[PDB]
Design a protein around this nucleic acid. Structure first.
Lengths: 140, 134, 181, 55, 339
RNA sequence: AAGUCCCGGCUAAGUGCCAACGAAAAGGCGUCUCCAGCCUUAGACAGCGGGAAGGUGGGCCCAGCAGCAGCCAUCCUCUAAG
RNA sequence: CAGCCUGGGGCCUCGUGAACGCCCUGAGCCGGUGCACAGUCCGGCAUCUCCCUACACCGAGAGAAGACCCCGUGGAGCUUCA
RNA sequence: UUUGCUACAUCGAUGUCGGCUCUUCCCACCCUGGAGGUGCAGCUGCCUCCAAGGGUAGGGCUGCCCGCCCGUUAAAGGGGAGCGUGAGCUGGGUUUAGACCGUCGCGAGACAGGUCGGACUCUAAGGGUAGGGAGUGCGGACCGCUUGAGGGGAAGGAACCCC
RNA sequence: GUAACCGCUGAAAGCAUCUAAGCGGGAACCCCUCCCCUAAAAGAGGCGGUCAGGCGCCGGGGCCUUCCCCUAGAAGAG
């Protein structure tokens, strides 16, 4: 199951990902930097800047630690809170992969969207996940 | 005043309650350092002073009209060795001060003994009455 | 209250070519051309008639009808700019130390204010021309915002005289607008 | 005023009819405003210019 | 009542652990700085220290054009050996991994000193021909070029070792294609120090400091020893309280390892590059080191590490000024260091 | 576990997502709504040009306050105008 | 405003060989709940296993049927105008 | 953050003042940074708003805390952590037993009045912290070089002088 | 990137107006640059090289202790 995250509300999309994960499926989320978050720029940043203790970041993606600031980390951290807290919720979390753009091995495959997470649902004044990570510290 | 713009800072020679000799004919003979002008420090540390520094002193020995009075003075000699920028180490035979008026002119009309040059450069009015400058 | 229907018309004069496509409206004329995006005008239909501009909206509250009449003023400013230019004047006022000002590419440099050795520098927006005659500064252009913002940057940089001093009228100040050219 | 109004009732081009000061928040306002643009107080007053000649 | 006193030590240096290698490499490099292809660092060995008398160069200095006394450190720097060429790119996953390494020792540069560290390539596996065309195929998406260099300790007798140290140094200069050409000319050759630095320049030093073992808190953090009676009274060399709470009782001072840490210095100027060792060797040898017999650097001030410590010298990354040549030296202390 | 349920409206602060559980007097035409009263095509409100006023700038007191410094009246060359 | 040096311990090894803590072994921490300051409960954020030295902040740490205070139709010694 | 009011918890014990040592936090801002007003000429003042990144020291007197005072300083802000911290110290204060004085009591004796003398136990199962070694996983046994998700930082702050 | 705020264009509300839409500036503050620990990051990364040869055996490569030491060191480690 490949999910195209272009012009999709971050929280609304995550709830469909969680149900797909819980049913025993592998979910790939491509274009993870093009999802949107409703609200002005200042409103959204203080939603994420009150988590700050300290600054620096230093590798390829892989950790998932107390402060996500990568477009891949932000999408993965949002889904994790919607998953069960038992041992399955840890096994199921390993079946989710998020990418910036479409990778080379998924180039000619069919992606799905959720019609009730589309950007057409809101009056306006949103930002993209890529713009959020630019201010959080991730170079993206 | 005039030579602080160089590396005006040496070995920390004197403190609060340190005793000095008064190297002029003002009337005093011995004094005790009461305050160091300009120092601002850290927890538990006693403020320090070296050559060419302005200090507040209290005269402990001298003529009746100056005894037990507070004055301003500058340090002119120090026992503890200090190094000039050309790499030479200097050392004197005692710690001494000269008492000045509030505007910087010496209170006495004569200075006894040698004077370091850093004190003569920073305080021109003292250099005018000093006979030998080392 | 809700105004049920409201409709306005803007006449396109001769010697002007108006193009509209995907909410982007560009006006071409003798003095120049201006391009402006109106994607933020939600709930408003912009119609490109053969000889005029048509703006329509229905059931406008106090905020939708406020938006509609600002779009009207923006369009009428674009039409005016491509027929007649915009010209703002700034005056150079000094008390004791004469002020020297010069233009270097896309920057205005102000030196020798009340005596300071710092050089004050102001940005110049695209499509704008700045010249110094004497005791006066002239800012040219077709887009009114760029002409106004550029003249305000010159205004703002020299304010800093307005710190720590009771104002004795030293700086560069805006003067007037709108010569025919 | 060091930042005048471009074509308005601006002053320092040969006038001193300055701005208006809010008494609650302290902000600057127009000479013909009725309330402050920051807090909407209507407790406004004029900036001081100078005493021209005498009594 | 709760006066103010700053904390003891830096909270940014924790953990104070032992360095995991004796020759560290910089993580970050200075920008291009508008030059033509050249290396941005060199490798040296700390010998000793003395003092010279120079005439001041800094035009803003209070002692301008006057003879002043300055301490200096002596760093012995033979030529290094260029081993391989390394290309970096942004791979999939969008990282800064290595594209390929192109080794060249077989044509000239058959060394067994190099086998004391790496049991390096057999004649069978000299298929480096197709590593080079991979670099040229994947040009235009290569971001950095680096050269692997090797020290030559066997040329320093006072430094009683023969196996070398291997590091990689970055090239900064013109275009990427221009840098690839320069890196192929140094490959298998010997790189003098004068091909990198010049007299009067500033540098940054990276190395490991002198080790000191398990230590207390009065030497590790410079805490205050308990005054009077307590100097007599149940133990004085300690801190009183270890925190207030059960909040993971916190980062307060504790005893442990002191010294042998990886550190960095800024803006250390090079005063002289010499070949005639008779102008630097003191009478009776440098105490506890030996005699200099290679090219040496005279670096004013102090340098981290002990004698015979490998030091990485880098271009200044936050330079204070831009010097010109010739800080003229009038006297060098060649007296004995004993007695 | 079961609604990304339906209709009419409001809020732009992340307000809020609180039965028992966490906010007063005061200020806001910020925006949304219902009652009053008073002016409107016999041209309202705002704005713009002019008339924008005269004996007289009357005056008491004053070198003079020539509305507005210490008390105060109150008359038409008038009509599409004071 | 601390530094260096010395004797005996500590540190590593061989031999001899105890005591106190102990519902349990299940004890990372932050905010709460609750007789109102939880290792174990709720919500989160964390957490690969073992070993050595060093430190004593937490375990409302260990040690003693609180000497203070009040009660009991409990005592004992002293006093006198009971 | 005071002092009271209540008597919910602890009486087969949660060591009770002050100081020292060390760590961290709040902001209702004393100084350092930004903006404005003034009955702001300049210098110096006074006031309002943002802001907790850094600083806030040395002494005389008293067991103190508060407070008064001395010489400086950019300023020498004010609070919390079981009035942070006695398995870290101290032992001046306070609350045993000895003794003197004043007042009170027939007396034995009392004071919340003054004064002299008066003990400070413990080898760290667990957690935490500071460091140093092995193992399994990634990944068949090894040699070498690296990246930079993440994490921490105050790594710098301030004053004086020249023009 | 913002705070307090200062400005531009601009209506609601013919005018005016820094704000409502739409823009521009603006702090020892926050994030990056810089310095220190970083592949036990489970998505647990990348790159160069060695593991001869003959018919499971012969033969062989590597690492450690022992040996001489110090840059290091409580034991280990380096």
């Amino acid at each position: 199951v490949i999910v195209d995250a272009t012009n999709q509300i971050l929280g609304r999309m995550s709830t469909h990902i969680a149900k797909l994960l819980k049913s025993g499926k592998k979910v790939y989320v491509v274009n993870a930097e093009k999802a949107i978050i409703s609200g002005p720029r200042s409103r959204v940043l203080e939603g994420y800047s009150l988590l700050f203790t300290v600054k620096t970041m230093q590798n390829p993606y892989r950790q998932g630690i107390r402060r996500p600031r990568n477009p891949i980390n932000i999408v993965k951290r949002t889904v994790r809170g919607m998953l069960p807290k038992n041992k399955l919720g840890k096994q199921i979390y390993r079946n989710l992969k998020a990418y910036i753009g479409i990778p080379k091995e998924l180039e000619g495959k069919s992606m799905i969207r959720f019609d009730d997470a589309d950007v057409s649902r809101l009056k306006g004044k949103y930002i993209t996940v890529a713009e959020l990570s630019r201010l959080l510290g991730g170079l993206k | 005043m005039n030579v602080l713009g160089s590396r005006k800072g040496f070995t920390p020679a004197l403190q609060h309650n340190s005793s000095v000799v008064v190297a002029d004919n003002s009337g005093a003979k011995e004094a005790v350092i009461i305050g160091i002008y300009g120092y601002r420090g850290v927890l538990r540390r006693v403020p320090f002073a070296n050559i060419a520094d302005l200090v507040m002193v209290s005269v402990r020995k001298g003529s009746p009209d100056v005894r037990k009075q507070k004055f301003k003075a500058v340090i002119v000699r120090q026992r503890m060795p200090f190094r000039r920028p050309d790499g030479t180490w200097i050392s004197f035979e005692d710690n001494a001060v000269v008492i000045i008026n509030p505007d910087g002119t010496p209170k006495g009309t004569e200075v006894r003994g040698p004077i370091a040059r850093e004190a003569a450069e920073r305080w021109p009015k003292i250099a005018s009455v000093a006979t030998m400058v080392i | 209250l809700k105004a049920a229907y409201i409709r306005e018309e803007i006449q396109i004069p001769d010697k002007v070519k108006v193009s509209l496509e995907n909410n982007v409206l560009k006006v071409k004329g003798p003095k120049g051309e201006v391009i402006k995006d109106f994607s933020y005008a939600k709930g408003i239909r912009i119609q490109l008639n053969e000889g005029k501009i048509i703006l329509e909206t229905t059931f406008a509250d106090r905020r939708k009808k406020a938006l509609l009449y600002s779009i009207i003023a923006h369009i009428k400013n674009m039409i005016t700019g491509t027929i007649n230019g915009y010209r703002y004047y700034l005056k150079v006022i000094s008390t004791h130390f004469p002020i020297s000002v010069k233009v270097s590419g896309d920057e205005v440099q102000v030196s020798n204010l009340i005596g300071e050795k710092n050089i004050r520098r102001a940005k110049i927006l695209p499509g704008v021309k700045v010249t110094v005659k004497g005791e006066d500064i002239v800012v040219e252009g077709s887009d009114i915002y760029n002409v106004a913002q550029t003249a305000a940057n010159i205004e703002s940089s020299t304010k800093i005289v307005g710190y720590d001093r009771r104002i004795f009228s030293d700086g560069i100040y805006i003067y007037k607008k709108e010569v025919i050219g | 005023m060091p930042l005048t109004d471009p074509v308005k009732l601006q002053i320092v081009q040969q006038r001193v009819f300055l701005k208006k000061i809010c008494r609650d928040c302290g902000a600057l306002n127009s000479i013909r405003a009725t309330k402050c643009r920051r807090c909407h107080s209507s407790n406004l007053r004029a900036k001081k210019k100078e005493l021209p000649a005498k009594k | 009542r709760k006066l103010s006193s700053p904390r003891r030590g830096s909270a940014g240096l924790r953990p104070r652990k032992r360095a995991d290698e004796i020759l560290p490499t910089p993580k970050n490099w200075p920008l291009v700085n508008l030059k033509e292809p050249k290396l941005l660092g060199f490798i040296g060995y700390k010998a000793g220290m003395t003092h010279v008398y120079m005439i001041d160069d800094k035009p803003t200095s209070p002692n301008y054009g006057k003879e002043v006394y300055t301490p200096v450190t002596i760093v012995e720097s033979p030529p290094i050996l260029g081993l391989a060429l390394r290309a970096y790119h942004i791979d999939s996953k969008g990282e800064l991994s290595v594209l390929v390494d192109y080794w060249a020792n077989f044509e000239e540069g058959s060394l067994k000193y190099l086998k004391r560290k790496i049991t390096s390539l057999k004649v069978d596996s000299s298929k480096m021909k197709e590593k080079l065309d991979l670099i040229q195929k994947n040009l235009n998406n290569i971001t950095y070029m680096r050269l692997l260099v090797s020290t030559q300790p066997w040329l320093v007798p006072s430094l009683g070792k023969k196996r070398p140290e291997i590091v990689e140094i970055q090239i900064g200069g013109g275009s990427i294609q221009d840098q690839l050409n320069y890196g192929l000319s140094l490959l298998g050759k010997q790189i003098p120090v004068r091909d990198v630095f010049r007299e009067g320049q500033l540098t940054d030093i990276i190395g490991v400091t002198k080790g000191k073992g398990f230590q207390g808190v009065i030497k590790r953090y410079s805490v205050v020893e308990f005054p009077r009676w307590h100097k007599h009274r149940k133990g004085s060399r300690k801190i009183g309280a270890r925190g207030p709470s059960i909040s993971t009782p916190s980062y307060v001072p504790q005893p442990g390892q002191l010294g042998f840490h990886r550190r960095t210095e800024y803006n250390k100027r090079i005063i002289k590059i010499g070949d005639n060792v008779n102008e630097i060797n003191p009478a009776g040898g440098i105490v506890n080191y030996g005699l200099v017999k290679n090219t040496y650097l005279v670096i004013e001030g102090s340098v981290l590490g002990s004698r015979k410590r490998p030091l990485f010298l880098r271009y200044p990354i936050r330079p204070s000024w831009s010097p010109e040549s010739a800080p003229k030296i009038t006297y060098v202390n060649l007296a004995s260091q004993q007695g």
